[PDB]
């Protein structure tokens, strides 16, 4: 429970790092953990490298997603504002 | 006997409920009738208007 | 134009670059001259953003409803005691 | 093109008329004092921005989708417009 | 020439009522009589009117005739009594005009320069502000033919101006007025959307509809363009209505922030003031 804890509080979100560091995340020599989570992790596998892409991520905007559930907000509000009235 | 006017006593208590729900429905209504008279009572009256010389 | 080279805004002043990035720079210190300047590559940009307007409404109610409420501690503080 | 995504590039002007680059300018901008499109050209990576189109004919198979496109906006209105006043219908009375 | 008509309920009515004269003997057609218009400016209005009586055989569909002595001393009656008033045209309660009412405007364009007909409802159904608006011109075509007369179609608008407000203000008796700001813009958001929903439905009902039966042809004096300024804006992103997104957005914020803002100050006042009189009324007398 603290080796896959680990891969779950790492990313996301965390910026560019480099390889032989991240040796030294997994520690061992070149252990086959580090491959599951290479894979797992998904983020990115970089030669020599890692990376956070694309981007930092999926970059949340929101545009008008949320206007619909403001629209909404005041739909139920303006009916607690006609309770009262 | 128990029984029959326990029975008994949410015959009056709905019909308040009702009269709850009614009157709530009444006072709104009513309300925006008001609503209306105060948009009676700021259009009356003019424009235009004659001023006078008040003592 | 925001964006422009320090060097050929200098040809057009007819100054050099050193107390031209200074007295800019000092422009903007006096705020009257919206911008800034990028020393790097050798850049001045200007940009706004003004209005400030609907900040001043809502801190000038709020800063001054926590006075409303401590006139409210006269009040029902003394039906207490 | 279904777009807009209405911005071009001006490798898709100049491989389709077969024009060079110079005059791609002279080419889009007449067409603007033609009356067909009133858009605006990109000079920086050369891209064109186009505005609005003029209608020209279409076609059969057309009316069909055109009632997919219009009733995809009858039932959107419906359901939201009917979701709207379903909240509230209660409170009206 | 005529961009817009006012029709007062007041013609209408003068119109329905006669619906009423000649509808308890019946039996078909329609009610037909001389409108009254008034013209100030390009917009057009209308105060009053008059029906005379009216019969279209269908044998001959393209017979029609109407009474020009109650067209001209009953002008001069209304002329006469009201100088303002004049004819502007005629009308018709429809519901759909068959071909052979061209004639009867080219018959009393001796009276006024250009007559406009007003097509009517008697009976309120569908889809919208009744009623409806012709004007006599010739468009010609660009296919060059010779010219013909296809009534292009003025929009209508129902308005008042002082009396005739005060009758039917009165009259109504029905629902809330108005009430601004609640109920009100959001039963239009029903009934412009829905109406609009079925409005384009049954009218491209009726663009397959023609297609498929009724040819020739309607395809295409105006299909072909008509239809791709239908495709010419699909419209979705991206990109530049992305940004219209969150500057929408951005837009919002400033409203609901005062919003928050009303809040706190009707709450602060009325409950403050409220609990105070309530406190102290309760302490007082008890």
């Given at each position: 429970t603290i080796r896959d804890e680990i891969a779950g509080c790492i990313e996301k979100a965390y910026e560019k790092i480099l390889f032989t560091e991240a040796t030294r995340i997994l520690f061992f020599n070149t252990p086959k953990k580090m491959t599951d989570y290479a894979k797992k992790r998904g983020w990115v596998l970089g030669p020599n490298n890692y990376y956070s892409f694309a981007s930092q991520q999926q970059k949340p905007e929101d545009t008008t997603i949320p206007s619909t559930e403001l629209a909404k907000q005041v739909i139920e509000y303006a009916r607690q504002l006609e309770m009262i009235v | 006997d128990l029984y029959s006017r326990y029975k008994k006593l949410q015959q009056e208590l709905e019909f308040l409920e009702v009269q709850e729900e009614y009157i709530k429905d009444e006072q709104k209504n009513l309300k925006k009738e008001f609503l209306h008279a105060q948009e009676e009572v700021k259009r009356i009256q003019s424009i235009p208007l004659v001023i006078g010389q008040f003592l | 134009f925001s964006r422009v080279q320090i060097e050929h805004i200098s040809s057009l002043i007819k100054l050099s670059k050193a107390d031209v990035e200074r007295k800019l720079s000092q422009m903007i210190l006096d705020k009257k001259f919206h911008g800034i300047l990028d020393q790097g590559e050798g850049v001045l940009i200007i940009f706004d953003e003004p209005p400030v307007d609907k900040t001043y409404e809502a801190a000038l109610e709020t800063i001054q409803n926590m006075s409303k409420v401590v006139d409210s501690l006269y009040n029902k503080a003394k039906k207490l005691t | 093109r279904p777009a807009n995504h209405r911005q071009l590039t001006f490798e898709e002007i100049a491989k389709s008329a077969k024009i060079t680059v110079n005059e791609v300018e002279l080419l889009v901008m007449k067409a603007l004092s033609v009356g067909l499109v009133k858009g605006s050209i990109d000079?920086?990576?050369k891209r064109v921005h186009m505005t609005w189109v003029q209608p020209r004919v279409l076609d059969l198979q057309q009316i069909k989708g055109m009632k997919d496109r219009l009733e995809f906006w009858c039932t959107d209105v419906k359901s939201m417009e009917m979701l709207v006043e379903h909240q509230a219908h209660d409170i009206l009375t | 020439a005529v961009q817009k008509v006012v029709v007062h309920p007041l013609v209408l009515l003068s119109v329905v009522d006669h619906f009423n004269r000649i509808g308890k003997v019946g039996n078909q057609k329609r009610v037909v009589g001389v409108l009254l218009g008034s013209w100030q400016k390009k917009v057009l209005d209308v105060s009053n009117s008059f029906a005379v009586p009216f019969d279209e055989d269908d044998k001959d569909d393209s017979v029609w005739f109407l009474d020009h002595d109650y067209l001209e001393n009953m002008y001069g009656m209304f002329k006469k009594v009201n100088a303002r008033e004049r004819i502007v045209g005629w009308y018709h309660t429809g519901p759909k005009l068959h071909k052979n009412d061209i004639a009867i405007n080219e018959l009393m364009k001796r009276y006024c320069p250009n007559s406009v007909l007003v097509i009517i409802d008697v009976k309120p159904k569908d889809l919208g502000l009744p009623t409806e608006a012709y004007i006599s011109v010739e468009e010609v075509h660009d296919d060059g033919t010779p010219t013909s007369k296809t009534f292009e179609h003025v929009t209508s608008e129902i308005g008042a101006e002082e009396a005739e407000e005060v009758g039917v203000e009165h009259l109504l008796?029905?629902?809330?007025?108005?009430?601004?700001?609640?109920?009100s813009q959001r039963i239009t958001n029903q009934v412009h959307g829905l109406k609009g929903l079925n409005s384009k439905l049954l009218d491209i009902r009726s663009y397959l509809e023609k297609v498929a039966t009724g040819k020739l042809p309607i395809n295409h004096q105006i299909i072909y363009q008509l239809q791709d300024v239908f495709n010419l804006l699909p419209d979705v992103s991206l990109q530049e209505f992305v940004k219209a997104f969150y500057l929408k957005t951005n837009d919002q914020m400033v409203v609901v922030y005062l919003a928050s803002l009303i809040r706190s100050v009707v709450a602060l006042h009325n409950l403050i003031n409220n609990k105070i009189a309530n406190r102290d009324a309760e302490k007082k007398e008890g």
């Amino acid at each position: 429970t603290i080796r896959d804890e680990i891969a779950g509080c790492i990313e996301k979100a965390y910026e560019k790092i480099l390889f032989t560091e991240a040796t030294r995340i997994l520690f061992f020599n070149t252990p086959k953990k580090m491959t599951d989570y290479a894979k797992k992790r998904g983020w990115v596998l970089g030669p020599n490298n890692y990376y956070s892409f694309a981007s930092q991520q999926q970059k949340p905007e929101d545009t008008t997603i949320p206007s619909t559930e403001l629209a909404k907000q005041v739909i139920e509000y303006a009916r607690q504002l006609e309770m009262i009235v | 006997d128990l029984y029959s006017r326990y029975k008994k006593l949410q015959q009056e208590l709905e019909f308040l409920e009702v009269q709850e729900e009614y009157i709530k429905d009444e006072q709104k209504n009513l309300k925006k009738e008001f609503l209306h008279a105060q948009e009676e009572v700021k259009r009356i009256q003019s424009i235009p208007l004659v001023i006078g010389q008040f003592l | 134009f925001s964006r422009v080279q320090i060097e050929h805004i200098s040809s057009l002043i007819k100054l050099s670059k050193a107390d031209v990035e200074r007295k800019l720079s000092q422009m903007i210190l006096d705020k009257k001259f919206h911008g800034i300047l990028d020393q790097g590559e050798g850049v001045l940009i200007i940009f706004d953003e003004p209005p400030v307007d609907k900040t001043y409404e809502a801190a000038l109610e709020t800063i001054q409803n926590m006075s409303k409420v401590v006139d409210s501690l006269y009040n029902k503080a003394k039906k207490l005691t | 093109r279904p777009a807009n995504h209405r911005q071009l590039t001006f490798e898709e002007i100049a491989k389709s008329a077969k024009i060079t680059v110079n005059e791609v300018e002279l080419l889009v901008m007449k067409a603007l004092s033609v009356g067909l499109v009133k858009g605006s050209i990109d000079e920086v990576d050369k891209r064109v921005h186009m505005t609005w189109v003029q209608p020209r004919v279409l076609d059969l198979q057309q009316i069909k989708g055109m009632k997919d496109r219009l009733e995809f906006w009858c039932t959107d209105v419906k359901s939201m417009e009917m979701l709207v006043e379903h909240q509230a219908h209660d409170i009206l009375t | 020439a005529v961009q817009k008509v006012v029709v007062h309920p007041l013609v209408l009515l003068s119109v329905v009522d006669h619906f009423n004269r000649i509808g308890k003997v019946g039996n078909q057609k329609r009610v037909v009589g001389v409108l009254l218009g008034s013209w100030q400016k390009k917009v057009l209005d209308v105060s009053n009117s008059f029906a005379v009586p009216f019969d279209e055989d269908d044998k001959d569909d393209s017979v029609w005739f109407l009474d020009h002595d109650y067209l001209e001393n009953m002008y001069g009656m209304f002329k006469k009594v009201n100088a303002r008033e004049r004819i502007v045209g005629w009308y018709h309660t429809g519901p759909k005009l068959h071909k052979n009412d061209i004639a009867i405007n080219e018959l009393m364009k001796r009276y006024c320069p250009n007559s406009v007909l007003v097509i009517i409802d008697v009976k309120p159904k569908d889809l919208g502000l009744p009623t409806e608006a012709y004007i006599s011109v010739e468009e010609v075509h660009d296919d060059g033919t010779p010219t013909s007369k296809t009534f292009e179609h003025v929009t209508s608008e129902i308005g008042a101006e002082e009396a005739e407000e005060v009758g039917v203000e009165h009259l109504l008796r029905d629902i809330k007025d108005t009430t601004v700001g609640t109920l009100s813009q959001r039963i239009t958001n029903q009934v412009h959307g829905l109406k609009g929903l079925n409005s384009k439905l049954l009218d491209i009902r009726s663009y397959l509809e023609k297609v498929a039966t009724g040819k020739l042809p309607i395809n295409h004096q105006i299909i072909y363009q008509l239809q791709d300024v239908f495709n010419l804006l699909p419209d979705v992103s991206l990109q530049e209505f992305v940004k219209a997104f969150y500057l929408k957005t951005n837009d919002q914020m400033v409203v609901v922030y005062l919003a928050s803002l009303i809040r706190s100050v009707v709450a602060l006042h009325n409950l403050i003031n409220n609990k105070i009189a309530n406190r102290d009324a309760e302490k007082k007398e008890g």
